[PDB]
Design a protein around this ligand. Sequence first.
Ligand code: SF4
Lengths: 70, 156, 105, 169, 110, 314, 42, 80, 98
Amino acid sequence: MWFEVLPGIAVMGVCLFIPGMATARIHRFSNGGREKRVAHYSYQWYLMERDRRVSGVNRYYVSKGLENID
Amino acid sequence: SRGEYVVAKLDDLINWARRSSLWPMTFGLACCAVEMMHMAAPRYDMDRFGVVFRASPRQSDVMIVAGTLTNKMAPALRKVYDQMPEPRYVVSMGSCANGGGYYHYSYSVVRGCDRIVPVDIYVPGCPPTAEALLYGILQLQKKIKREKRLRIWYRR
Amino acid sequence: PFFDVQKKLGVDLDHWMTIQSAEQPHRIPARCHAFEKEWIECAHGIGSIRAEKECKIEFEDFRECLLRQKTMKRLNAIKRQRDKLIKEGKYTPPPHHSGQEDLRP
Amino acid sequence: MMTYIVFILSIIFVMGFVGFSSKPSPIYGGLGLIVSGGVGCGIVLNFGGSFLGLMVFLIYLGGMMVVFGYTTAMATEQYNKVVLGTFITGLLMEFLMVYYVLKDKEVEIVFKFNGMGDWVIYDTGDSGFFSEEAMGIAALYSYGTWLVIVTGWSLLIGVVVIMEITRGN
Amino acid sequence: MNLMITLLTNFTLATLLVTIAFWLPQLNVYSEKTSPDPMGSARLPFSMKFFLVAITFLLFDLEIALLLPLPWASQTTNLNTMLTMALLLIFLLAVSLAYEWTQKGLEWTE
Amino acid sequence: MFMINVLTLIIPILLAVAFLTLVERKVLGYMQFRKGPNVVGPYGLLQPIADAIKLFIKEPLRPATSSISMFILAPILALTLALTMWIPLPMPYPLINMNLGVLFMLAMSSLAVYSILWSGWASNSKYALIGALRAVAQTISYEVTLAIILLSVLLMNGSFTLSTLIITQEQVWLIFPAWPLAMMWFISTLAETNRAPFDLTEGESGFNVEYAAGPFALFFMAEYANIIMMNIFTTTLFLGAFHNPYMPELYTINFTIKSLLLSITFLWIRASYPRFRYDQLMHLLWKNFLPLTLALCMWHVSLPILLSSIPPQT
Amino acid sequence: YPTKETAHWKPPPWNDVDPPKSNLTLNFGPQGVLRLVMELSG
Amino acid sequence: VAAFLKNVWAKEPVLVASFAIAGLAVILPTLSPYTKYSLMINRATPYNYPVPLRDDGNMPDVPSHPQDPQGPSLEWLKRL
Amino acid sequence: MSLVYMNIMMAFTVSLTGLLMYRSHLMSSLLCLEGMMLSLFILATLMILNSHFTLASMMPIILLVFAACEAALGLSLLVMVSNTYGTDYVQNLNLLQC
Ligand code: SF4
């Protein structure tokens, strides 16, 4: 009866779940297993550029910890 | 050979696509239009076959002539048929569209709509029942199914 | 005629937007705050003729800050001479100008 | 060739102007103005003016040029040498400026123009935790009381004037 | 660079789809049609109401543009002046709407 | 790597709108005591494929257009502004993270009417031109009311960033402090996309009747993508979900369910009411919606000031 | 001082009002069935 | 007055509701005691750097350290 | 000065020459005028954002709105012309030669 419309809604729900999951997995994969950094203002971009310039890899997501000091 | 099989499968694919998505353009002339709308009713439900209800004449495939075609009306029907995209089919439903019916000997009635447009399926009745018109639509689907356009193109 | 209604009535309508070294939201400074400030404190109250003949140095400095004619002219000269010596083969770029510097921070 | 991106965009900008300075038809002139507006929004986007670029897209293109084309559709009923001639002429002079300023890096017509990229005159600092242009616009209510008053009175008077003069009686 | 790439991808997918839709059944062989709407011979008469609602939309859109930066402006230090100017802007918008209402401006396209 | 993200954004849009046509037919049919398509595939799952292959092999109309440039360009702009408009959507992370995503979407909403205008102009029939003018007027009027409602809701939010709407809705939904704005926003998005009971071209002519089967299909894809995205925008704006930074799939499933319910509500509204007249919907906007919009705009300007509830800029 | 060029120039009207120098008609075809000929004024 | 108000509540409820909301919005900030809290919340946000002052020798009110008791306090914002 | 200043000034110049030579219509001249206003907008905001003039960022929006309001007025006048001679041709606006 009324549940025969559910395969179409299931297909639509799969097709709408795909882009968000894909974007989250791509962001985690391309940024060292973490969230993509949000740079909405110039200060956050300055911090991101400082991490990229301090990593030694030219990758901002390789975070240098306390082992890199004397 | 390979090419004959390829064009046979392609012809089957396009035949299924054309026959499973028929969009009809009815002609609400007379009694047979009321019986057509009774076929579109929830009991018989043309829409479950992919046959939509009241499609526009500018995008429709099949024209259903349901009613009596008079002398004052036939040029409009021919204009509508000429402004329809190919591939197109015409279904004559009821006795009036087939051979005039009750008003065959009238001075102002076209004795059959086959004098104006070429007709593929003739549905007899006065009015033919909604099951009869649905059976005619299914028979038109069978007629579309056994088309051989690509086989003729490859053979020529 | 210029009827100074604002100065007679003591109201402020458009003086906050006239110049560039004025009070700004969040005290954001412009790129030529000091030059225009120096030009304004020169030319205050000495008249237009004395302003245009007495501190032309400050106005030239402010215009140079504003449009940067001489700066990009010097940059054009440096880049043109560098390209000419690169074509003539007597000059090469150092490694720190090529992208292997491992910069400061 | 990437570093000249704004300059490259600017070429399309003036090219779009020759799209409607020749005046081929109001529909094609409107299309050229739409292309020029999008290109100018991109130009101001590359300078940090995001709110002003979206002002260009929201108010110029989607607000005013829509009304211009909407009134165009009520005239110039649907169905030249001079249009193509001045288009070719303007394109030829425009590429002459491009070639000259890319050749000798310093030209003049009325003012002295430099042939370097647009990236040189940029600022090396950081604005902090805010966008300077955003707070500059946001100071419309805190500082621009008089400007708000005269603009609102102008818009109200414009509404009155518009509905008055088209009455015809 | 990401936004330009996305815009170019959307644009090129759109023109690929338009070219496919406009040219794929063109290679089929069919029969042509003659060169021949209720108002074919009649000219289009002008209507003042559509132009009036167009200009009304334009003026309200301009006042919307003036009213837009309120989320940024709410973080100010002159809160009384900001509140007064915002309320004055919306009040002038409502006054323009009411004056258009009273003078039969919204007639037959209400 | 980024182009993979773009493709995984844009191809499910086309799949979703094809199966939205299927879901519309099935749900509409079951609401009027019959069935939808269940013959072509198993429960009609092969119906959109058959419709697409049928529509792409039909003979093109080839109308006698006054201009061919506008005739080509209207589907171009329609599809481009249908697909570009999905990118700043925070699901829960956007494809392009922008500071002014709401303003971006409003700009493309204002820009989308040129497809209607150029389609009306390119057709040689002047009746299609009249219908296009009426559709353009309706779209720009509801654009005005959309802009004011969005301004008030974002003034509650405090910034134009679309991802901040998830943060500002962590405790409670925004349908609780802004339900009149929610109702009027829903009706305005209904009337924006020429959705029932606000469509006029179907009733007594269309602007896109002169287009071929292919371009009509592309216009259909653009319109249905706009419908789905508008429902997603309403879900993000008013009915935000719980977001866990370690499991984004929770937010994805939650807002997917909510936007599916809102799209089903769109189809449900389509099969319940008679069509509005043109002057009646003008009366609904300019004499009913707009005064309440201005009053609620004043209320939402003044409310955070008097409650010490001003949201942060960042 | 009339010349050859300004020989056809007429004086303006005394009230400065010039002479002012239609109803739309539609034909809805048979596309039950009915043909309507309508005369509108907007 | 009461007959007129009931009449417009009978004919035009939308305009009555809009005018009531607008009047509430225009008279309520002048009566709510929380506007000053908004003012000093907007004042206390540190957008810029608090640049230190040179110690001339007599400034008892200004602090010498961030954790010193001098300077403004923020317990009211912590509690509210 | 910069290259984009030359390009924007040239755009303003060609739109001015487009305005000053009427071809047949008046809508085309109105479009040329709005092109001039757009070039003024772009030049002003480029100069303002280059020099970090903070308060002056409030200005070009006004430069839009006022001029945009003027555009609406112009459209109305065109419609009045279209109500008299049935077309927006400029060669009908010569009733005041005598
Ligand atoms: S065939 Fe019979 S039922 Fe059908 S239209 Fe003719 S008279 Fe009516």
